[PDB]
Amino acid sequence: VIKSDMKIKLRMEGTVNGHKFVIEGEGEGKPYEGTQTMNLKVKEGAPLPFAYDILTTVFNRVFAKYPKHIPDYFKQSFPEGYSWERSMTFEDGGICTARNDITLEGDCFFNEIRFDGVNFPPNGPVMQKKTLKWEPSTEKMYVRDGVLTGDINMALLLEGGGHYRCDFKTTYKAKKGVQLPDYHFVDHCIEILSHDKDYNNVKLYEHAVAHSGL
Amino acid sequence: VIKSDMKIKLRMEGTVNGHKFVIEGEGEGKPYEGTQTMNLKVKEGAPLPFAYDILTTVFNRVFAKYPKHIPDYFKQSFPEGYSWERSMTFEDGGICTARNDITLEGDCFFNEIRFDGVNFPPNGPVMQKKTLKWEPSTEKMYVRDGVLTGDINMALLLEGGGHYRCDFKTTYKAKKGVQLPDYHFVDHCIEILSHDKDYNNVKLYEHAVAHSGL
Amino acid sequence: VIKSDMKIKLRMEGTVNGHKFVIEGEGEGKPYEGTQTMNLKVKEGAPLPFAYDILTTVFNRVFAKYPKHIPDYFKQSFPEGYSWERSMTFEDGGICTARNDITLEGDCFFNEIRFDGVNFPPNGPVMQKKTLKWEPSTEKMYVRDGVLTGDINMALLLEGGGHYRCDFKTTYKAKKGVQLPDYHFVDHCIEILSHDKDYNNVKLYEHAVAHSGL
Amino acid sequence: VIKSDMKIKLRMEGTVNGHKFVIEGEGEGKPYEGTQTMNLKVKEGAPLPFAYDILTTVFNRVFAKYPKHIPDYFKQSFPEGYSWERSMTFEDGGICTARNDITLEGDCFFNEIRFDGVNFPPNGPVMQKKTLKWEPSTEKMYVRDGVLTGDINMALLLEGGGHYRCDFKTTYKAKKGVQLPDYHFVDHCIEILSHDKDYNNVKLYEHAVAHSGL
Numbered sequence: 042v043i044k045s046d047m048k049i050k051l052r053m054e055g056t057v058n059g060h061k062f063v064i065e066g067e068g069e070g071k072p073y074e075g076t077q078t079m080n081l082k083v084k085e086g087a088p089l090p091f092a093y094d095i096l097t098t099v100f101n102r103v104f105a106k107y108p109k110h111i112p113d114y115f116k117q118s119f120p121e122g123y124s125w126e127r128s129m130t131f132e133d134g135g136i137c138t139a140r141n142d143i144t145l146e147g148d149c150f151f152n153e154i155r156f157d158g159v160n161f162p163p164n165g166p167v168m169q170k171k172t173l174k175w176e177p178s179t180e181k182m183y184v185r186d187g188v189l190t191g192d193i194n195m196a197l198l199l200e201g202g203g204h205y206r207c208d209f210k211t212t213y214k215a216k217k218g219v220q221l222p223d224y225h226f227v228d229h230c231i232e233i234l235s236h237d238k239d240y241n242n243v244k245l246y247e248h249a250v251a252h253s254g255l
Numbered sequence: 256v257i258k259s260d261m262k263i264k265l266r267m268e269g270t271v272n273g274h275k276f277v278i279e280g281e282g283e284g285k286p287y288e289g290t291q292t293m294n295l296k297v298k299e300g301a302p303l304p305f306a307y308d309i310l311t312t313v314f315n316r317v318f319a320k321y322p323k324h325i326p327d328y329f330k331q332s333f334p335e336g337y338s339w340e341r342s343m344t345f346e347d348g349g350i351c352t353a354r355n356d357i358t359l360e361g362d363c364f365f366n367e368i369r370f371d372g373v374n375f376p377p378n379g380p381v382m383q384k385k386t387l388k389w390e391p392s393t394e395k396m397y398v399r400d401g402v403l404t405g406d407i408n409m410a411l412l413l414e415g416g417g418h419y420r421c422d423f424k425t426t427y428k429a430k431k432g433v434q435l436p437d438y439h440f441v442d443h444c445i446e447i448l449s450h451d452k453d454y455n456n457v458k459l460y461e462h463a464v465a466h467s468g469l
Numbered sequence: 470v471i472k473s474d475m476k477i478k479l480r481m482e483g484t485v486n487g488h489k490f491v492i493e494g495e496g497e498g499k500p501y502e503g504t505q506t507m508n509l510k511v512k513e514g515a516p517l518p519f520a521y522d523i524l525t526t527v528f529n530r531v532f533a534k535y536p537k538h539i540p541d542y543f544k545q546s547f548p549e550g551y552s553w554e555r556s557m558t559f560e561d562g563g564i565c566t567a568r569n570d571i572t573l574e575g576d577c578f579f580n581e582i583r584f585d586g587v588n589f590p591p592n593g594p595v596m597q598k599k600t601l602k603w604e605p606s607t608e609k610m611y612v613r614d615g616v617l618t619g620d621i622n623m624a625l626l627l628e629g630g631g632h633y634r635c636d637f638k639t640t641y642k643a644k645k646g647v648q649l650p651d652y653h654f655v656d657h658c659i660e661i662l663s664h665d666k667d668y669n670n671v672k673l674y675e676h677a678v679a680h681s682g683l
Numbered sequence: 684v685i686k687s688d689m690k691i692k693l694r695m696e697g698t699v700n701g702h703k704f705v706i707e708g709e710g711e712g713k714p715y716e717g718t719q720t721m722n723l724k725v726k727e728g729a730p731l732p733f734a735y736d737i738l739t740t741v742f743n744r745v746f747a748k749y750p751k752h753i754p755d756y757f758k759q760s761f762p763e764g765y766s767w768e769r770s771m772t773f774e775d776g777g778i779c780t781a782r783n784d785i786t787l788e789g790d791c792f793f794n795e796i797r798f799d800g801v802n803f804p805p806n807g808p809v810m811q812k813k814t815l816k817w818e819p820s821t822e823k824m825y826v827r828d829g830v831l832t833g834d835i836n837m838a839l840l841l842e843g844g845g846h847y848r849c850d851f852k853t854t855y856k857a858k859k860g861v862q863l864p865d866y867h868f869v870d871h872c873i874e875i876l877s878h879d880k881d882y883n884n885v886k887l888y889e890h891a892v893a894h895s896g897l
Contacts, residue, residue, distance in 0.1 A: 059338055059356065126273070130344075134342070138351070139373070140273060140373060160426050185376070186377055
């Protein structure tokens with residue numbers, strides 16, 4: 042079922058700072074190379090009044106290169122699939138919650154996403170769209186009460202330089218029992234490859250690689 | 256417009272641990288006495304698989320007794336009204352986001368509520384419904400970048416005794432400029448007066464009183 | 470042993486931002502009225518390069534008015550006495566740890582204090598001495614694994630107005646078993662009554678009152 | 684001054700849970716290979732009543748392999764040297780503060796260390812010595828207001844399996860201006876190579892490597 046080439050369909054509905062929106066996406070990736078590319082269209086709530094970058098890491102750890110010696114929680118989870126929940130705690134008190142329900146129909150991953158952001162200061166970098174990109178990162182993966190937890194120290198590079206910090210916690214729940222991995226890492230980088238004026242259209246790329254550290 | 260007796264209508268839509276639900280409520284309160292009572296019906300997602308108590312403080316600081324010497328951000332905000340956003344950070348990593356858009360039509364407050372909870376441990380008190388009540392509390396109210404912020408150290412009393420701690424941050428945004436108060440407190444207590452087996456029906460009561468501390 | 474009038478002797482040794490100091494104090498209070506006054510002298514590390522206010526709440530919950538219906542963990546702890554540990558988490562990442570070992574010799578409380586502060590931004594209000602006072606507060610008191618825990622949402626009023634937030638957690642350990650109270654509150658206010666140029670000399674006052682909330 | 688082979692002398696004084704101790708160490712490392720080994724003796728407060736592992740990462744980022752393309756804040760700081768401050772926020776509310784003042788005399792780094800830990804639950808893994816090791820980690824390094832900040836998601840592996848999480852923030856201050864690096868990573872692993880019954884004697888090893896991520 043998980044082939045060397047898979048397609049991806051997604052719908053996100055969300056509210057940030059009380060602003061409602063819908064974004065749909067279509068793309069493709071190489072699960073075994075840990076790469077994926079997606080084309081995202083704002084369907085409702087254009088133009089977004091917040092930094093598009095807060096959304097991009099919510100737009101599937103199936104797209105991560107897992108070595109033999111590390112059990113692949115994500116790939117083992119299919120065909121049944123899995124869901125995740127995430128909190129994003131920004132250093133200025135902005136908080137987001139997000140979830141994705143991931144299903145497999147043929148060679149296509151369907152992603153049903155909800156995103157909610159609250160308490161962004163009105164003159165902070167998110168509401169004033171001062172973000173350039175996410176720096177690369179390393180997710181710390183560990184089992185807690187029988188499900189996979191990922192913690193990340195994430196940072197947005199700001200216009201003018203310097204960084205806006207965010208702590209991620211993701212809980213990943215396979216819909217069937219799998220071989221649980223030991224403590225390990227997933228390196229990430231995520232890049233907006235192109236966008237129009239108000240990010241109504243966005244081409245998004247991720248590379249991810251699992252490893253056991255030093 | 257804000258009389259000694261007002262009615263309240265609400266709809267909450269939410270997702271906790273991936274479980275979708277809708278709850279509607281009707282009730283009444285005394286804004287100047289800082290009291291209110293509400294009758295809540297689960298409309299979708301019965302029976303709730305999580306502790307109903309995580310919802311109750313999301314089900315309007317108009318219902319708080321404000322003394323003369325403290326400017327009433329909430330009552331001054333009408334007829335135009337106000338909205339709030341809240342993060343609830345539980346000590347075991349459970350996080351909720353919530354928002355309420357409050358409008359005034361005649362003597363009735365309409366409440367449009369969204370609630371989302373993530374990362375509740377499956378064997379924690381919320382997913383195992385081990386909560387008895389919220390302890391009383393004191394909200395710390397202060398202006399930050401021109402809007403009212405409230406911080407609360409909240410605690411749920413547990414079955415077996417001892418407490419489950421939650422930190423609230425609420426940002427309150429009047430839809431028109433008002434007299435901003437100085438740093439002050441709002442004492443709260445919130446009580447489920449009655450409920451059926453699975454909290455399909457709930458009668459809920461709050462008392463709230465603003466003060467300037469010692 | 471705990472009379473209506475008691476004396477207080479203290480020595481604090483500490484390091485903030487790498488700056489070492491020693492402060493000694495002598496004063497007096499009314500345990501049953503929940504009041505105390507103290508005279509503090511900087512003995513080493515004058516002039517302090519940080520906001521003196523970060524120290525003042527570390528300079529004994531014996532000085533709190535406890536009503537009959539709330540068991541007094543502190544007063545019950547003597548003659549043997551008690552110790553406490555505290556973390557102070559400031560909203561800009563400044564963190565302090567502090568401890569006090571409290572003994573009773575005659576009508577005098579001896580206080581052996583250690584205070585350590587790290588990660589204060591060099592252009593933040595603590596290192597630029599922009600604090601005016603602590604706002605009043607309400608400490609939430611609860612038992613956790615057999616010892617009394619206090620949580621406080623504290624705020625320093627800043628020069629220019631607006632607030633610098635700090636979260637306190639104190640663990641209070643009686644040196645003998647006592648009647649553990651139920652969940653309750655202690656209202657505080659703390660005031661620098663007078664000081665010289667660089668706070669080499671400071672007269673400090675606290676009022677504290679325990680209550681059961683609404 | 685920073686040769687391919689350097690010696691290390693250290694003294695830590697600290698208090699955890701009110702327990703006072705002094706630990707001295709002597710060792711050696713390869714700054715350009717990012718390796719170091721140290722022999723630590725408890726001089727006061729034997730036997731330690733807490734998990735020795737909370738101390739080991741406080742026992743100098745000079746011992747990290749820095750590639751050409753990343754400015755070496757640490758090595759550039761000598762001969763004048765640098766100091767750091769650290770907060771360690773454990774997931775059960777245990778908090779430590781630590782600092783190190785690092786000087787260079789000949790081929791020897793001198794380390795003047797203070798460590799303070801508070802609010803460790805009495806039946807938690809630190810006070811019940813249930814820790815096996817620190818998992819490897821990746822420190823996120825970024826400049827904030829002109830000094831180097833490092834954030835780490837750290838985890839102790841527990842007896843019985845599963846993990847105890849700790850968030851590190853270190854502020855690193857060179858005693859002279861240097862070439863500030865861009866956002867980057869330092870991979871770490873730290874290992875107790877050997878110890879006696881109560882960790883009165885400990886041989887400690889670290890490997891560290893700076894990189895720019897994916």
